[PDB]
Design a protein around this ligand. Structure first.
Ligand SMILES: CC(=O)N[C@@H](CCC(=O)O)C(=O)O
Ligand SMILES: CC(=O)N[C@@H](CCC(=O)O)C(=O)O
Ligand SMILES: CC(=O)N[C@@H](CCC(=O)O)C(=O)O
Ligand SMILES: CC(=O)N[C@@H](CCC(=O)O)C(=O)O
Ligand SMILES: [Cl-]
Ligand SMILES: [Cl-]
Ligand SMILES: [Cl-]
Ligand SMILES: [Cl-]
Ligand SMILES: [Cl-]
Ligand SMILES: [Cl-]
Ligand SMILES: [Cl-]
Ligand SMILES: [Hg+2]
Ligand SMILES: [Hg+2]
Ligand SMILES: [Hg+2]
Ligand SMILES: [Hg+2]
Ligand SMILES: [Hg+2]
Ligand SMILES: [Hg+2]
Ligand SMILES: [Hg+2]
Lengths: 291, 289, 290, 291
């Protein structure tokens, strides 16, 4: 809601504008009376460890121009770092972490740390943020025998996210879910973000990763656009598509079958976020249902 | 940058009238150490019955640059919800027996009450941070007897300190978690006692509706309890039951660990300002004898 | 401290449409040096006739973190006051002949107009600092001919720089003072020119009601004057008289000192933003020429 | 008008408070609704060169609690230092500087310097201050033959001072006056401050000096109170009341003849001002009508 452009906000806004067209684009967003949620942004765990300042800076820009994102982040790399320090190797199937009781302890502790890290970086920039670490995702077991403490999300409770935004604070969420009776269950961040998007139907849906999209492994070329109805089935049969990419793309396809056809998902690097959000950039991989 | 209005400064002056009161305030106003001003436990009933006065008093503390650690309960509204759905509340030794359905009600109630308090504060211009999990680590108190109830074994200070450092009042629930991530129900008086133990605040305050503890055998409010002299005999009295017994027990165990200079005030919210700014306690004061 | 509202940012965006314009704004927005963005001379009449527009335009500049040096006149208010007293205004070569009584009137009017503008700015949330003396030191221009009229010999920058450093728009009169403290009257166009000479600002703007200079022999507004080619011929034209003649000469002598990249814009307040943010001038532009 | 207590303002207020009586004294000023000007404060020129931080700091306290003083400063000592360096002996009669053309140029320069020094120190503390160096005092020649460029003040134009206060800025004045036709005339700062106090009829009238009051030259002791109706005539016959002190005492006597008997004037060091204004300390020299 609250628009308050600091010196850094003004510089961020102007520094890459070069045309009337770009100016007009920003004017359209700043004069908008829409009540639609602006954005759900999924943040790769690696970005919080490697690229915190940059992440905090673009989130701060959005905050200062009154366009609050719902932010959901992962924690995969730092979990593997802790397990390795303890002489334990991680285990996945279908891109999903097999999560026994000891692994869940590490996952929970790492999520809390990395969540607070991001919230604090934001507060150090004068951006109000709330760590939302429980009470959003209710889940049952995806498959206890196979994955152990891994959740299948059944419902999203919106009130803590909306209360945060209403209070003027960015809601910063982990992908942890809970059963009704309170057993925490690990969920993949790509999946949890998609559930948020499903229920909020935001203007913008963004997945931030380091590669800045999805890279065709046979050619090495970045895939600019994916038309799911045409390309999904045979894209998934390609042997270069890694488990994590397969999980990501499956979730997005399911998400976009629910959302209206006007919705889309951008998979992009954080340095290209502003131009993709505001000035209609072709950076990253854009994914839509299509025909 | 901190600033205070005329009304805030006037109310501040109205609370301070001696050199030691001034010094106490300024000591905590400009945080020169990791020392904490207050742990304030809020009875759940206050959030449903007297929220505006609770929020206003906490908002005054914030506006004079003080950041109490606030932890609230939710027992009465859990009891309300259960009775509303035709389920009778289930306690033993003052502790709620918490099966799988009861825990879902407790969690949802905790979160609702928490957001209610946080939002009332925000509406008064107070930055408040919900801290609903991640502080209390527990194992099962007694599975067979209480089911999903915790016995706290550690307090993680970071989220509370981070909140204060960001200039927001931390508003905590008493939910705890096992290492493996099973949330457990903990009595809010007990949890508050665990916070006081690790933070060693200047002030330890429990807010209830009665404004202290009443002696059942006489019908008179108890002004002071000297534990070393009175605890053993007091716990034998048959009028001392349920939640009260549990409250006195935890406070006794807390004050055994804290220095003799510490004390615990059980008061009504209308006595909070006087209890925090002066040594002339109100309600029921408890100290080591 | 700095923050900008939505409507401030919207208005900034409406003023910028090229990369060059962005880099120009950013250069002056982020400056930690003594470089100056603008000297803006305000015609006295505008304070009587169109104050709110003037004050709003200056407020926008302040709200985007730009700190123009503002110097204003008061000629027409003085003439009205003299005529209210049954005194005929007395000019030669565009300069007011200023005896003791007239100096009292000029001083009072100047201080009044100054406080009028400063207060209008403050009402819009703009910090503005009256600077009514201590800037211009002067000798007598010609005591027999003009009486209490000054020829400016130095400009003290300190009061203006301190205002800007504190985040306040400096609002100046053109009153000057002898070393020993006799105030001397100076034409506001000339004093503004002296300010431009020592500050060498990016932008030199003269605000008048006509939005430039009209060629008397055609009735057409002059869009551009290239002084090297046109100045001698122009000053021989019979329609070039009084205050307009003085203004042109003063601008010419100013531009003899400044680099060829400089220019002076004589415009109406409605064109101030365009003139400040873009290279597409308005009204009457004056330069040396290439 | 605008009350806004900063961190340092709160500490400044409470630091010295030990009793309920002191508290109630501050409550009286903070709950007040009277339209009367709070204070006229004369600042000896030396304080601006010698103890500027401390001066800026107590003025800042008054600003932040919404009790704006009208501030008038001198510059006598630094003019003498300038003259000294040019090989010129300072020239005084009856505590008033004889001021020829050269000396007026020094006085003027050096007034503007001290004025801007004070204004800038206030602004650095986040206090809005407006330099008011002309347009307040209109004067005739005091005695051209005897004093040269020295003024006798005939009127005080209030508008600039009231406009500054209304805008939220402390008005910081020099004592320079001007004739109708614009010859600047030098006026002693003690006299100009008296002329301000006459027309503003403030609640408090304070003269700040480094000595911290007036010293009885014969006994070698600070004078705490002067009852003028009783003491004035004999005081003016004492050998140790000459130069500025004589001028000051006479100007204060004439001021308190015009003002009601409830008014008084304090002469004090800046370190004792807060306690003097708010909690009736009895430091420095208090002067009043008496009987
Ligand atoms: C179930 C599962 O795979 N959880 C992910 C969540 C963290 C993330 O996505 O970065 C994990 O790595 O444990
Ligand atoms: C274990 C237990 O009794 N917990 C409390 C928590 C709420 C409170 O203390 O207000 C309960 O009523 O469930
Ligand atoms: C000397 C001289 O002509 N001064 C001008 C100054 C006012 C103005 O320029 O608006 C005058 O009118 O007296
Ligand atoms: C006339 C006169 O004596 N003026 C004083 C003004 C400065 C002051 O009072 O400090 C002077 O010393 O010149
Ligand atoms: Cl960005
Ligand atoms: Cl860990
Ligand atoms: Cl209240
Ligand atoms: Cl419920
Ligand atoms: Cl509920
Ligand atoms: Cl306008
Ligand atoms: Cl000097
Ligand atoms: Hg960890
Ligand atoms: Hg509930
Ligand atoms: Hg309180
Ligand atoms: Hg305008
Ligand atoms: Hg006039
Ligand atoms: Hg000097
Ligand atoms: Hg003071």
């Amino acid at each position: 809601n609250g628009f308050s452009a600091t010196r850094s906000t003004v510089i961020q806004l102007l520094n890459n504008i070069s045309t009337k067209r770009e100016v007009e684009q920003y004017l359209k967003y700043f004069t908008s009376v829409s009540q639609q949620q602006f954005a759900v942004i999924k943040v790769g765990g690696a970005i919080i460890s490697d690229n915190l300042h940059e992440l905090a800076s673009c989130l701060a820009f959005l905050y200062h121009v009154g366009l609050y994102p719902i932010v959901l982040h992962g924690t995969g790399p730092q979990v593997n770092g802790r397990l390795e320090a303890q002489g334990i190797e991680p285990d996945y199937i279908d891109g999903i972490r097999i999560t026994d009781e000891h692994t869940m302890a590490v996952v929970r502790k790492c999520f809390l740390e990395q969540n607070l890290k991001l919230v604090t970086a934001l507060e150090q920039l004068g951006v109000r943020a709330r760590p939302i670490t429980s009470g959003v995702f209710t889940a049952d077991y995806l498959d206890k025998d196979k994955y152990k403490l891994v959740g299948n999300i059944k419902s999203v409770t919106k009130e803590p996210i909306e209360a945060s935004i209403k209070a003027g604070a960015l809601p910063i969420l982990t992908s942890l879910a809970e059963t009704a009776s309170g057993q925490m269950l690990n969920v993949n961040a790509d999946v949890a973000a998609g559930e948020l998007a499903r229920v909020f139907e935001p203007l913008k849906i963004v997945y931030l990763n380091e590669k800045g999209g999805i890279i065709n492994g046979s050619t090495g070329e970045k895939i600019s656009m994916i038309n799911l109805d045409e390309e999904y089935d045979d894209l998934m049969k390609q042997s270069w598509v890694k488990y994590g990419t397969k999980l990501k793309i499956r979730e997005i396809k399911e998400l976009l079958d629910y959302l209206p056809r006007s919705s889309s998902v951008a998979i992009i690097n954080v340095q290209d976020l502003q131009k993709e959000l505001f000035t209609d950039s072709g950076a990253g991989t854009m994914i839509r249902r299509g025909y």
